[PDB]
């Protein structure tokens, strides 16, 4: 960081933002991961058992990433608009 | 003016 | 360095303000200008207040 | 003794940025100047500091018009 005595870049620029505690316990699930659970019911606990999300994750979002071929029942998770389309197209259903 | 001090002695050290 | 900083506060009660300077000796009367208040999105009267 | 001089200001990089026949995009600064040594002709704007800039794409053209023999810069839409 030392620049010969000139105020270094990381000191002449301002600090910004704060760190969310909620972000640390939130995860994202790819469509490609929905097939890796056991039973075809994607909930928070089945995702953990399948090593998809960490043990201390409380919230998870399914996003449109990869593909989903099989029918899966997503229960309790948030799902993006695009992911909702993909899951329902594959024969799955989203329970709130 | 003088550009050198007048010569002086050194302290004794164990020689070898 | 005689001109003091002032704030012009919105009369719309939005809490939105502009800042400017003012020579308080020469012009003691309060500054009052219609300016755009972005909170209500209208030109409203803005009136002088302490910075 | 000493000196009472020893001061100057930073150089301001004025002057012509795009010469005759150069193709410029709209927005391009053509000349930076103090006061209007050059005046804005067709498709050229004059900024608050008398910067001349292209208001359209095209080629820069210098020209002398009028009785005073004033220098105009214009953009030939190309």
């Amino acid at each position: 960081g030392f620049e010969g005595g000139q105020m270094p870049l990381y000191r002449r620029l301002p600090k910004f933002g704060f760190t969310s505690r909620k972000a640390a316990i939130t995860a994202e699930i790819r469509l490609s991961d929905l097939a890796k659970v056991e039973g075809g019911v994607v909930d928070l606990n089945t995702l953990k058992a399948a090593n998809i999300i960490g043990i201390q994750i409380e919230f998870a979002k399914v996003i449109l990433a990869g593909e989903v071929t099989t029918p899966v029942t997503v229960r309790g998770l948030r799902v993006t608009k695009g992911a909702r389309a993909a899951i329902e197209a594959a024969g799955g259903k989203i329970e709130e | 003016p003088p550009h050198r001090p007048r010569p002086r002695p050194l302290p004794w050290f164990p020689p070898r | 360095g005689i001109r003091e900083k002032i704030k012009l506060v919105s009369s719309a009660g939005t809490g939105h303000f502009y800042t400017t300077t003012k020579n308080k000796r020469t012009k003691p009367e309060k500054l009052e200008l219609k300016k755009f208040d972005p909170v209500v999105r209208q030109h409203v009267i803005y009136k002088e207040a302490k910075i | 003794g000493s000196t009472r001089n020893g001061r100057d200001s930073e150089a301001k990089r004025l002057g012509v940025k795009r010469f005759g026949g150069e193709s410029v995009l709209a927005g391009s600064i053509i000349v930076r100047q103090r006061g209007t040594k050059f005046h804005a002709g067709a498709n050229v704007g004059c900024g608050r500091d008398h910067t001349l800039f292209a208001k359209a794409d095209g080629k820069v053209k210098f020209e002398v018009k009028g009785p005073k023999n004033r220098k105009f810069i214009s953009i030939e839409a190309e």
Binding site: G1, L9, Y10, L13, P14 | - | - | -
Partner: protein, 64 residues
């Protein structure tokens, strides 16, 4: 031992998708009345660290 993050740098820079860094502009903390609105408006959004500076930033943030 593990390299230590320069903690001050981590509060000022955030890594973007293609691996650059964003930062907040200097000169918008105070003395705002004298500055033109245009100047201030252009300092509001976050900017990207420049090529010359990336090396310095990267060194400070080994786990970014």
């Amino acid at each position: 031992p593990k390299i230590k993050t320069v903690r001050g740098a981590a509060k000022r820079f955030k890594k973007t998708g293609k691996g650059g860094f964003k930062h907040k502009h200097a000169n918008l903390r105070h003395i705002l009345t004298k500055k033109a609105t245009k100047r201030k408006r252009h300092l509001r959004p976050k900017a990207m660290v420049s090529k010359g500076d990336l090396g310095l930033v990267i060194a400070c943030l080994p786990y970014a």
